[PDB]
Structures are given as C-alpha cells and as structure tokens.
Design a protein around this ligand. Structure first.
Ligand SMILES: [Fe+3]
Length: 277
C-alpha cells in the first residue's frame, strides 16, 4: 500500500521532534532521506572531481600503483583500465595517488563516518536499544566507503539484496537524462531513489535489525543499469558508506533466520566475522 520515502532533519530528530513518525518508518520501511547531518553536496563534488581527474589524467604507472591487489581486500581503485570505475577506503590500509587526494578523501571519509555514527546513534535511541558493551564501543567499528563512477557518455538485472550493515549512507549525483538507478521495495512496490538536493539517503541494514531485536526493517534494493534507449547522458556517481560492526560483534541465530536472513552456520550464536568468513 504505502510507497513513499520520508525525509527528516537529523538535528530535529536529536531535538526530540517527530519521534512517532521516525519509529514507524524504521519498523515498516527502514529507509529515509536526511538533511542537516554534516554532509553537503559541495564536499561530494570535490571528492568526486579529484577522483575523476585521476581517472582522466593519471599516468599508466600511477594508476597501477593504486589499483587494488586482491578484490577480497577492498581498497584502492578498480576499472581504471587505460561500465564503471570504483574507489574503496576503510579506516586504514588505504591507497592514495597524491597528498591532496589523501587529505580530501581522508576528510570526506571522516565526515561520512561521523554522520553515520550520528544516524545510528539516533536509530538505537528511538528503539530504546543498548547493545552489549555500550553504544559507543559498537559504533566505533570497521566502516567501508565505496565510490563508483559511470563515465561512458556526457544487460543483466540482478536481484534485490539487503545490506550487511548497521546503517548505510548514500549520496549520488544525478543523470543529465533523468535516469534513476537506485530502487528499493517499500510497501510492496519498487520505488525510485533519486538525487535529492541537500539530502543523504539512509538504509538500515541487517545488523540494525539484529541489534534492535527486530524493531528495524532492512529494505531490499538493487541498482539498475540503463537500457539501450536511456544511455545518452547517463553518466553519474554514487558514494556509499557502510557502517559495519567490529568482527567480534555477536548475535542470536534463532533471531537471524527468524528475520529471514540466509545464515550458513548453526548454534545458539555467532559473530559477524564468521557470517562472512
Ligand atoms: Fe546494497
């Protein structure tokens, strides 16, 4: 029935406003747009410009030195070869082309990490939730940022997934031609998730569901390639920041499958580590 995605100001939520609507939204949709949270369009454009500058003008030997060694370990570039190029970062072990790149992207990652902790902190407070060990130890974690860029201009459809994250924050730049790759299931339909001025998009992931004892939905979503007719003017970017728990974070396996999550393992409990390793 209900297929819209709400918008909230983070400062207002922190200010105690809109408590009932926020709780409903988490339980029933697990996704929303967010303003006033310490992220800006301008910070995104600059980070984006630098990486595109490198894509276009970095030499062959420079490009190889920052290309990721093994895709398992998720750092450096992919697809620079001179669909899409990709740049990934974590809290350490990062690969940078230059000093200014390192500074701008370190700052961008820090702000994004900070915005994500603040959002997660709000999700836990609205569901009256205290993870074991405390909120702060839990949010001081092992996050990952992935920035994708689709150049071509100025195919297999994959199945919707949920994210293996406490929270995921998504910023994007729009397509000239109006095309929207990001879609989620809300109330039984597939809804578009476009660029919205001065808003970051937020998804709750499975970890949010687990940590709140089922009070938050993790929405299924997929990103779609353009069809042949909608290729002209389909260049775009996204920045995706996964707030992932520490490897030693633990959960009840009754609970996990009871929520509908493919779990290989068995027993009373497990870690996040073995749930992907
Ligand atoms: Fe995803």
């Amino acid at each position: 029935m209900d297929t819209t995605v709400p918008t909230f100001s983070l400062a207002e939520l922190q200010q105690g406003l809109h408590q009932d609507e926020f709780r409903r939204c988490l339980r029933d949709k697990g996704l929303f747009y967010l303003t006033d949270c310490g992220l800006t369009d301008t910070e995104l454009k600059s980070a984006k410009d630098l990486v595109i500058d490198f894509f276009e003008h970095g030499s062959e030997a420079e490009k190889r030195a920052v290309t990721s060694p093994v895709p398992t370990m998720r750092r450096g570039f992919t697809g620079l070869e001179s669909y899409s190029m990709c740049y990934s970062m974590g809290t350490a072990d990062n690969l940078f082309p230059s000093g200014d790149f390192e500074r701008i992207w370190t700052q961008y990652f820090d702000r994004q990490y900070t915005a994500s902790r603040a959002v997660a902190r709000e999700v836990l407070r609205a569901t009256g939730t205290e993870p074991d060990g405390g909120v702060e130890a839990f949010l001081d974690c092992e996050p990952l940022l992935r920035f994708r860029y689709f150049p071509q201009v100025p195919p297999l459809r994959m199945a919707p997934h949920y994210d293996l994250s406490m929270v995921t924050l998504i910023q994007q730049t729009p397509c000239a031609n109006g095309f929207v790759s990001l879609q989620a299931e809300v109330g039984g339909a597939f809804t578009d998730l476009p660029y919205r001025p001065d808003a970051v998009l937020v998804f709750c992931g499975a970890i949010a569901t687990l940590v709140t004892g089922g009070q938050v939905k993790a929405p299924r979503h997929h990103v779609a390639a353009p069809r042949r007719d909608q290729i002209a003017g389909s260049s775009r970017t996204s920045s995706v920041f996964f707030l992932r728990p520490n490897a030693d974070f633990t959960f009840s396996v009754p609970l996990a499958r009871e929520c509908g999550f493919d779990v290989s393992l068995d027993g009373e409990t497990a870690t996040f580590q073995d749930w992907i390793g």
